[PDB]
Design a protein around this nucleic acid. Structure first.
Ligand SMILES: Nc1ncnc2c1ncn2[C@@H]1O[C@H](COP(=O)(O)OP(=O)(O)O)[C@@H](O)[C@H]1O
Ligand SMILES: [Mg+2]
Ligand SMILES: [Zn+2]
Lengths: 528, 159, 210
RNA sequence: UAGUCGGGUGAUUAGCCAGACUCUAACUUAUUGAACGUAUU
């Protein structure tokens, strides 16, 4: 139509796509360029011209919320609050919405997930239905993609319909354009507290092929990730990389060169081994000479894991025992994955899974980890020592620069690494009627954790339920009651403070300071 | 919506709604207008428009029960910090009605195409219609186009 | 809290009368500059820096409609209901959070000196002053309870932090009493107390210095 | 900083220039019907 032509020439993606579908060159290329075009910034990071992120979320009579509106950041949003404030509810709502994109990328007219009629409607909602309304952004050509998931309570006569067609329309563009000419695809993933499973290598899934590109969408919003799928995929990559003779020749050439240097250095004991390896190299060269994408994929993932996971310096596959084993160098020691602590394993699992999916979905990028997507992580600090909490968000954002992260945390240490604009905080005595969430008043990034406890988490830096926490206050009051002189009562308490906290304690130093100041104040008063 | 009587009946059914909300808004210095299903509120006082959605829901429930409801997805706040439009008309930061920059640039594009005889008859007709609308919303734009493109060209086009 | 010097009545309060008129009618930008003169951009009850703020009726408008457009009853409190809910000290808490209270047994800072009733310990707590009995104790204990001057963690934490930051400077000055003569030392203490007029939580900082 | 508004230039829905704005905060929509503007008469 002439109307569609005008809009399309104005840069509207949906109009361009409609024209392509009816006339089935120009319009195809418009759609493909809209999705693929980008640039490398000053920092050497690829940036798509058309960003994809969740802009806004609205919850009506959903779980604890009567009516709640959230504006999200393009890059990082962190939701904070006490237990039972609905932080997990918010992520669940988003994940269910994203399921509609994933379903329709996989299959025309595919079905996403649903709100529960048993559990998701607010218990005291007068109207017996719930709505989750989301709006997504995809560049200036598609500023608004609205979705609504709805559900009526069980046994209600009137049934409220979901509105999902815009999700389907956008997902159709990705699917159809990709079919004709390969494009990069968005990553969607949820990592909830269910990610903390015991590992079993022994259990294998024999459903689907792991090297099939659309396996990247397999159970992506299920909450655990599929760390088992990673291991299988990584072993697969290893076997293929070993099998191609040129890399084996290059590896063998490198081994021969290293062994030759050792023999030249005076170690005559390794001469027999050098001769064997030289023979193997000659044989390999004689067998027909030939870069493996699988080798590059393997390297990317290895780097990602080692960069993000602090205790892990190396990861590799062994087959010499006779079974396939993934090993890691953890704190300088070579161990199996099963030998990792739960904290290390769970975090490794998250990063490995995410990296695998990004590599699979972004084959045309030089760095596939610079692809687009939305990743939800519940309780990022789960199982992490405070040392790790100080460098978890930084590492994630460095490794995955174009992902929109939506995170929940209870950790002041995590908050100390994040800008106040990224933080969304529940009102202290909300009770489910608050309309809009807001940022804290205090700047958190670079701030002391004690301040964040008090100013942002609403918790005393010193435990009020412990008597010893009040001794210094009581001591000060006694000193002021006796015009600054240590009486019998003040001396007893002083001795208690000394005995309990120790001679070198900050508390005792404060007490000493109080004595000195009050004595001097009294002396001044007497002079006057 | 396609029946000739439906506009009249719909406006009538909203009569009492309009009365009540108009009165309420007037007390707190809010301007209110309704264009069919589109409700618009504006004010110079900060932090007053936040209460209006809740007020609307109560009133709708009172008058219509569950028959008429707010579309919560379509409730939007704006200010001079951001783009402001009312029924397809842009309100610029000089508090004047505008067609919007993008539409104006598109019109100029079409005129330039006409200038070099590149406009087909369909697009020509389209351009003429759009200029009539532009004349109604932003007459100053037409004066500027006359200045930019020669009165003669424009008169030829509008003949 | 500070003892506040109320001076002159602004002109707009002459016009509006109780019964007929409501507080929604009166302009608030007319009233502020005299309160900002009185208080110095600081809260009447807690002494935070004012940014989110409202005009507070010391006796509330519901219970006492006589004292609605009366200059003695008005104060610049912290917090603002219009902008953001969930504020938990001073004007807003007196209404919502604090339950029943007798209005007569509270420190009105224009009339009374707070310093006689309240003491500010350097550990951060506000307490009754040493040696109060019966009625004066009841006023001190209720001013603390009703304005939530300890129970707000944000306030308590901010006040402790500020006092603890200056306690090196307090100990260091009082050592140099000995070496300096009286005119040098009394000029120094005057100079430090000069600074803390422009500072947040000034009464708490005063008790640390003097 | 970013986002927005848009006077100008520009074979012109781009790009470029100039000036401005900032309640936590626009996402440009729908006919043959209705109304409005224009043409016809
Ligand atoms: N259908 C419901 N109706 C009312 N309250 C609900 C409903 N479902 C859950 N809740 C309440 O909402 C909270 C859910 O907590 P959750 O979303 O897990 O928050 P968080 O992760 O921050 O602890 C609990 O306080 C629970 O009682
Ligand atoms: Mg028509
Ligand atoms: Zn206050």
């Amino acid at each position: 139509t002439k109307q569609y032509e005008r809009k399309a020439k104005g840069g509207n993606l949906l109009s361009a796509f409609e024209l392509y579908q009816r006339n089935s060159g120009e319009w195809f290329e418009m759609c493909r360029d809209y999705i693929q075009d980008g640039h490398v910034d000053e920092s050497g990071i690829f940036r798509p011209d058309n960003a994809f992120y969740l802009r806004r979320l609205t919850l009506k009579d959903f779980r604890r919320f009567s009516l709640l509106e959230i504006k999200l950041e393009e890059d990082l949003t962190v939701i904070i609050g006490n237990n039972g404030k609905g932080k997990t509810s918010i992520l669940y709502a988003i994940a269910k919405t994203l399921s509609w994109f994933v379903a329709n990328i996989l299959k025309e007219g595919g079905s996403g997930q649903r709100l529960s009629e048993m559990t998701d409607i607010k218990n005291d909602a007068e109207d017996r239905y719930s709505d989750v309304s989301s709006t997504f952004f995809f560049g200036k050509g598609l500023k608004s993609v609205p979705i609504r998931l709805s559900r009526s309570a069980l046994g209600t006569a009137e049934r409220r319909d979901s509105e999902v067609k815009p999700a389907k329309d956008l997902a159709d563009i990705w699917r159809v354009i990709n079919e004709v000419n390969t494009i990069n695809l968005p990553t969607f993933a949820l990592y909830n507290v269910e990610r903390s499973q015991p590992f079993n290598r022994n259990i294998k899934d024999n459903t689907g092929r792991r090297e099939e590109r659309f396996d990247a969408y397999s159970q992506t919003l299920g909450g655990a990730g599929r760390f088992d799928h990673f291991v299988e995929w990584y072993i697969y990559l290893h076997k293929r990389t070993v099998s191609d003779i040129s890399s084996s020749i290059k590896e063998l050439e490198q081994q021969v060169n290293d062994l030759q240097r050792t023999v030249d250095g005076g170690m005559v004991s390794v001469k027999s081994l050098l001769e064997q390896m030289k023979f193997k190299l000659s044989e390999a060269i004689e067998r027909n000479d030939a870069v493996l994408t699988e080798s590059v994929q393997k390297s990317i993932v290895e780097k990602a894991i080692c960069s993000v996971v602090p205790s892990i310096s190396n990861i590799w596959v062994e087959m010499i025992t006779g079974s396939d084993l993934v090993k890691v160098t953890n704190d300088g020691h070579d161990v199996t994955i099963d030998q990792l602590s739960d904290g290390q394993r769970v975090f490794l699992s998250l990063v490995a899974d995410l990296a695998r999916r990004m590599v699979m979905l972004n084959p045309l990028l030089e760095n596939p980890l610079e692809g687009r997507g939305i990743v939800l992580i519940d309780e990022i600090e789960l199982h992490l020592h405070p040392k790790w909490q100080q460098e978890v968000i930084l590492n994630l954002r460095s490794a995955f620069p174009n992902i929109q992260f939506i995170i929940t945390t209870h950790s002041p240490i995590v908050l100390s690494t994040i800008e106040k604009r990224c933080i969304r905080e529940f009102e202290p005595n909300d009770d489910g009627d608050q309309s809009f969430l807001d940022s804290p008043d205090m700047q958190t990034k670079g701030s002391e954790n004690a301040q964040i406890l008090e100013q942002v988490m609403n918790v005393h830096s010193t435990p009020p339920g412990i008597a010893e926490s009040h001794w210094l206050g009581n001591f000060e009051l006694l000193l002021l009651d006796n015009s600054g002189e240590l009486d019998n009562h003040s001396q007893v308490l002083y001795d208690q403070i000394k005995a309990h906290f120790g001679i070198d304690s900050i508390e005792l130093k404060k007490a000493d300071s109080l004595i000195r100041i009050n004595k001097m104040k009294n002396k001044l008063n007497k002079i006057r | 919506v396609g029946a000739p009587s439906s506009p009249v009946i719909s406006n009538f059914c909203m009569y009492e709604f309009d009365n009540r909300i108009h009165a309420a808004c007037k007390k707190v210095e809010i301007t209110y207008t309704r264009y069919a299903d589109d409700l618009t509120f504006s004010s110079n006082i900060p932090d007053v428009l936040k209460a209006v959605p809740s007020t609307l829901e109560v009133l709708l429930k009172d008058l219509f029960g569950s028959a008429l409801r707010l579309n919560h997805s379509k409730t939007v706040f704006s200010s001079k910090a951001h783009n402001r439009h009312v029924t397809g008309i842009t309100i610029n930061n000089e508090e004047t009605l505008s067609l919007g920059r993008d539409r104006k640039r598109f019109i100029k594009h079409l005129i330039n195409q006409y200038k070099y005889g590149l406009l087909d008859n369909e697009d020509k007709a389209y351009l003429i219609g759009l200029l009539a609308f532009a004349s109604h919303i932003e007459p100053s734009f037409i004066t500027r186009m006359n200045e930019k493109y020669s009165l003669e060209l424009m008169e030829r086009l509008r003949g | 809290m500070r003892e506040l010097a109320r001076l002159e009545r602004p002109e707009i309060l002459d016009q509006y009368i109780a019964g007929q008129n409501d507080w929604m009618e009166i302009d608030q930008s007319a009233v502020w500059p005299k309160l900002t003169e009185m208080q110095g951009g600081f809260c009447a009850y807690c002494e935070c820096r004012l940014n989110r703020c409202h005009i507070e009726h010391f006796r509330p408008r519901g219970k006492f409609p006589a004292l609605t457009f009366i200059w003695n009853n008005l104060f610049g409190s912290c917090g603002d209901s219009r902008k953001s809910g969930g504020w938990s000290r001073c004007g807003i808490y007196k209404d919502n959070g604090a339950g029943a209270y007798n209005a007569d047994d509270l420190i009105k800072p224009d009339e009374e000196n707070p310093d006689d009733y309240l003491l500010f310990l350097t550990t951060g707590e506000v307490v009754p002053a040493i040696g109060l009995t019966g009625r004066a104790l009841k006023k001190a204990q209720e001013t603390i309870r009703v304005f939530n001057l300890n129970g707000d963690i944000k306030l308590f934490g901010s006040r402790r932090t500020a006092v603890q930051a200056i306690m090196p400077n307090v100990e260091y000055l009082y050592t140099l009493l000995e070496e300096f003569d009286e005119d040098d030392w009394n000029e120094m203490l005057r100079d430090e107390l000069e600074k803390i007029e422009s500072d947040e939580y000034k009464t708490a900082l005063k008790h640390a210095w003097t």
